[PDB]
Design an enzyme around this catalytic site. Sequence first.
Site, PDB file in Angstrom:
ATOM      1  CG  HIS A  68     -12.496  60.451  12.866  1.00  0.00           C
ATOM      2  ND1 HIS A  68     -12.213  61.446  11.947  1.00  0.00           N
ATOM      3  CD2 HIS A  68     -11.317  60.181  13.477  1.00  0.00           C
ATOM      4  CE1 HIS A  68     -10.921  61.772  12.017  1.00  0.00           C
ATOM      5  NE2 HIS A  68     -10.351  61.014  12.928  1.00  0.00           N
TER       6      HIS A  68
ATOM      7  CD  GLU B  29       5.080  48.885  36.523  1.00  0.00           C
ATOM      8  OE1 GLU B  29       5.784  49.549  37.372  1.00  0.00           O
ATOM      9  OE2 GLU B  29       4.853  47.635  36.591  1.00  0.00           O
TER      10      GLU B  29
ATOM     11  CG  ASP C  90      -6.936  60.479  13.725  1.00  0.00           C
ATOM     12  OD1 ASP C  90      -7.870  60.196  12.887  1.00  0.00           O
ATOM     13  OD2 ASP C  90      -6.164  61.421  13.635  1.00  0.00           O
TER      14      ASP C  90
ATOM     15  CB  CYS D  87     -20.262  51.940  33.641  1.00  0.00           C
ATOM     16  SG  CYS D  87     -19.967  51.060  32.121  1.00  0.00           S
TER      17      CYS D  87
END
Lengths: 339, 345
Positions: free
Chosen positions: B25, B104, B63, B130
């Site tokens: 999307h 966990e 979604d 990152c």
Amino acid sequence: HMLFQNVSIAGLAHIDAPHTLTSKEINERLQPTYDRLGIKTDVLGDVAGIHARRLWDQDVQASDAATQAARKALIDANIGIEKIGLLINTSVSRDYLEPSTASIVSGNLGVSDHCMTFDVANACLAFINGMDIAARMLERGEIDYALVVDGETANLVYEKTLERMTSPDVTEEEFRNELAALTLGCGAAAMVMARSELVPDAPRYKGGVTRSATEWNKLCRGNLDRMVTDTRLLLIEGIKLAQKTFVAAKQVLGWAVEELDQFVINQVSRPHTAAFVKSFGIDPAKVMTIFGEHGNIGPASVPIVLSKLKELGRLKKGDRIALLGIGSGLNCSMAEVVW
Amino acid sequence: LVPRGSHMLFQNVSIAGLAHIDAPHTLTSKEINERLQPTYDRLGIKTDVLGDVAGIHARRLWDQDVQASDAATQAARKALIDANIGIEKIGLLINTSVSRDYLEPSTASIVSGNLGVSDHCMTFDVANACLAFINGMDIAARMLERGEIDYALVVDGETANLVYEKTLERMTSPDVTEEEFRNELAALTLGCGAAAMVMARSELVPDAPRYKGGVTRSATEWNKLCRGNLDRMVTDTRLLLIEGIKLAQKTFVAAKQVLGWAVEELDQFVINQVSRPHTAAFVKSFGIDPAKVMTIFGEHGNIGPASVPIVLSKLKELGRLKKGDRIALLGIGSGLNCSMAEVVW
């Protein structure tokens, strides 16, 4: 097949959290709800065998507890922070999703600009995984010394699990899958690992094996406020997985039970420990236990146990020590240390 | 003539398979801006800070019910197809994502259970903002080099839905302050996506790209600059830029020593995807030709640790990469940490 031969344990330390909550105190708070829902067994004290656990001061974060353990471990190894090339954080508790809790501990300590840092998550096995990662870098010559740290905080889990389950609308079977959260404990540990040529009299980490049964990854699921667990199934499958891992450990480490001087295991509950001991036919004298007074401190329980063994003078030169973890995943790891 | 050491570079480690998944999307910066416009008006903001200053025109979302594990698992199946191997060959699987299903078990355990790994497969998660995909690659490469496994999966699924939703709500509050609006704006540059890599002992995949590893520097005194939880990310983008570039320059001195690097000798620079000013700063600071730095943030935003392998997969898919190309992987992550590693295609 080829074990680690130049990886040592240069320093090791644990921190006991300072506030005690007893299961008697928990049970009084929950009695209304035990009553108005008809439960008669003391699950914490009588089934689990957990009589107390410890909690931190409020607003102690995981990074703070890991930092305190790290400082102690560095003093135990007699090295400055400037010698550390790798800092791995292995806790379940984490300050944020980003950055890594490792970077926070690393900053609190003042590591150098050559220090590599990151977090490993893997439920109650992560400390051993962290040791194994570090050993691999030590062996290759990338670093001379590593810190593996782990701070666990259960304060929030207690506040929300309890205050939840004492409210008018509290249901059930929920209860049996959430009371496991009331077995969790606070604590921290750290270890300094090093190249053996730097610390020749120190214990040696040989490495180990891992087996998995990740078909069961849904069995134990934890966030900040909630842990939902299927305790029965975890136990049974955990043990089958451990038996398989023990056959692997025979093949790569020459393991037989009768030759091991200590089994340092992740600390969960009396039934988990008894079933482990009974299945493998282990002398219970070789298995130290801390869950009675600390509960389940997740991946820190392994090094906390080892550090307690060391400080009580239980460990002698030449002792063969098994480190093992059965954790959510399910995963099982077994590794050797020669003291 | 003079024998030199390997400088701890990996030997006989290859990339057997690589794939990415684009989330479905599209959320345009135009739509976001229309929703933020009354707040912009009230704060006196007259420039398009997303589209004109950051250079992000769109990002993708899944979604609401897609977890990190679901996305990772789809990328992993694609990577396994690209490597032409079954899941049974995988001896190590590392999940490197910032997003995580739970505290966990590990997200790597969920992925593994979805894919049906064997009982010899070792799994765990690595978290390092990152940089983590590269950290995963390194960890797997140490095992592959040592001959402990034949193949590893490094996987990464990123979900930003929740952060978008809750940031946009806080940012449109009548009482939001300037400073909070500035602190949270970077979260509206994030994107969803996933990637996965199969790595292998080179003897098994002789013509495949080789992974050499490289060098890491840190500046963990800056660990407060970017902090994020499941629904909120607070970022000082000005010092992340300055201190990121300063860390990069330092890491690049080390790279010159261990990798032999010179900017003129690298065919591509695969960098974590942040924003137009970060990329322009990086390129100008080092004197890199922009043509060698592919950017996907314009249409996908910042996909965190997955950005590095997503860009590499998209270079592969475009045919931009040829045998013998020298590819620099460069990550500057929250922490601060920097790694610079080489792939020879």
